[PDB]
Design an enzyme around this catalytic site. Structure first.
Site, PDB file in Angstrom:
ATOM      1  N   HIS A  61       0.680  -1.183   0.003  1.00  0.00           N
ATOM      2  CA  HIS A  61       0.049  -0.085   0.054  1.00  0.00           C
ATOM      3  C   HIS A  61       0.877   1.134  -0.008  1.00  0.00           C
ATOM      4  O   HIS A  61       0.539   2.373  -0.447  1.00  0.00           O
ATOM      5  CB  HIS A  61      -0.913  -0.054   1.210  1.00  0.00           C
ATOM      6  CG  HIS A  61      -1.441   1.488   1.597  1.00  0.00           C
ATOM      7  ND1 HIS A  61      -2.337   1.906   1.230  1.00  0.00           N
ATOM      8  CD2 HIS A  61      -0.778   2.311   2.673  1.00  0.00           C
ATOM      9  CE1 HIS A  61      -2.468   3.346   1.937  1.00  0.00           C
ATOM     10  NE2 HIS A  61      -1.621   3.376   2.845  1.00  0.00           N
ATOM     11  N   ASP A 117      -0.164  -7.901   1.171  1.00  0.00           N
ATOM     12  CA  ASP A 117       0.315  -6.493   1.611  1.00  0.00           C
ATOM     13  C   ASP A 117       1.558  -6.488   1.999  1.00  0.00           C
ATOM     14  O   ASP A 117       1.777  -6.252   3.305  1.00  0.00           O
ATOM     15  CB  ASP A 117      -0.641  -5.708   2.409  1.00  0.00           C
ATOM     16  CG  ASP A 117      -0.515  -4.188   2.516  1.00  0.00           C
ATOM     17  OD1 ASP A 117       0.111  -3.714   1.586  1.00  0.00           O
ATOM     18  OD2 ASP A 117      -1.131  -3.693   3.440  1.00  0.00           O
ATOM     19  N   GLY A 155      -0.619   6.113   9.041  1.00  0.00           N
ATOM     20  CA  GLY A 155       1.049   6.562   9.431  1.00  0.00           C
ATOM     21  C   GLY A 155       1.802   5.195   9.955  1.00  0.00           C
ATOM     22  O   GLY A 155       3.056   5.070   9.623  1.00  0.00           O
ATOM     23  N   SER A 203       1.199   2.170   8.971  1.00  0.00           N
ATOM     24  CA  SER A 203       1.127   1.278   7.882  1.00  0.00           C
ATOM     25  C   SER A 203       2.556   0.695   7.280  1.00  0.00           C
ATOM     26  O   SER A 203       3.230   1.611   7.324  1.00  0.00           O
ATOM     27  CB  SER A 203       0.387   1.679   6.589  1.00  0.00           C
ATOM     28  OG  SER A 203      -0.923   2.400   7.217  1.00  0.00           O
ATOM     29  N   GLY A 204       2.781  -0.510   7.277  1.00  0.00           N
ATOM     30  CA  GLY A 204       4.051  -1.090   6.952  1.00  0.00           C
ATOM     31  C   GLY A 204       4.705  -1.359   8.024  1.00  0.00           C
ATOM     32  O   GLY A 204       5.950  -2.091   7.775  1.00  0.00           O
TER      33      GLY A 204
END
Length: 224
Positions: free
Chosen positions: A41, A83, A174, A176-177
């Site tokens: 993403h 993802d 923020g 994410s990942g």
């Protein structure tokens, strides 16, 4: 990170931030001197990678550009399945006490395991409050069966759910990942959840790292 607290300084040397125009874009994890692991993403044509400080904006931090990234081919923007993405650093990360490789998993941790998710994402939702300091929160791994009661067939077996009963404790935009660490190993990458964030009994959904070992390693080898 919702309902967490600042991480103990120096305890997340494998945590990185992906920036765009000097603003936080995503979290990520240092795999080795050349590679960052994050969510698909977070795809961009160029990244500015922050490493070596619990504080965004710290002069002491390394700021490395990255021009190449590779999303897992099974990634879908519709369902967020697969993802994950590898980001190739333009120059090697200089290792120290503040910059270290994460321990990749060999096994999958069971439901009920206590984990820590970390990031510079908003600490409030819907209203945004982006912190300078890296935030931490403890969550527990939730069974696919219990998670299915909330998200139905949107959930896949490659996704991992975590949260605390009747609690706002979770990751948000923020984060994410970013890393979800359980018993010394990276078990997840922040992927998705409900919006507004921090809704009680709505688990945070993560990419289950233990299922993607082979792709991670083959991709780094291929694009060395």
């Amino acid at each position: 990170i919702i309902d967490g607290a600042p991480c103990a300084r120096g305890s997340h040397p494998w945590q990185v931030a992906l920036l765009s125009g000097n603003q936080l874009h995503c979290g990520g994890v240092l795999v080795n001197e050349r590679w960052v692991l994050t969510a698909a993403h977070c795809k961009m044509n160029e990244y500015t990678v922050h490493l070596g400080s619990d504080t965004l904006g710290d002069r002491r931090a390394q700021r490395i550009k990255a021009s190449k990234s590779f999303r897992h081919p099974g990634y879908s923007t519709q369902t967020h399945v697969n993802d994950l993405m590898l980001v190739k650093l333009n120059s090697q990360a200089r290792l120290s006490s503040m910059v270290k490789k994460v321990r990749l998993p060999s096994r999958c941790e069971p439901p009920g395991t206590t984990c820590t998710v970390s990031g510079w994402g908003t600490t409030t939702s819907p209203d945004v409050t982006f912190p300078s300091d890296l935030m931490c929160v403890d969550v527990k791994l939730i069974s696919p069966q219990d998670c299915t009661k909330v998200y139905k067939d949107l959930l896949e077996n490659s996704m991992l759910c975590a949260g605390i009963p009747d609690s706002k404790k979770n990751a948000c935009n923020g984060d994410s990942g970013g890393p979800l660490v359980c018993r010394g190993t990276l078990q997840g990458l922040v992927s998705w959840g409900t919006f507004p964030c921090g809704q009680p009994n709505d688990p945070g959904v993560y990419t289950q790292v233990c299922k993607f070992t082979k792709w991670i390693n083959d991709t780094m080898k291929k694009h060395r």
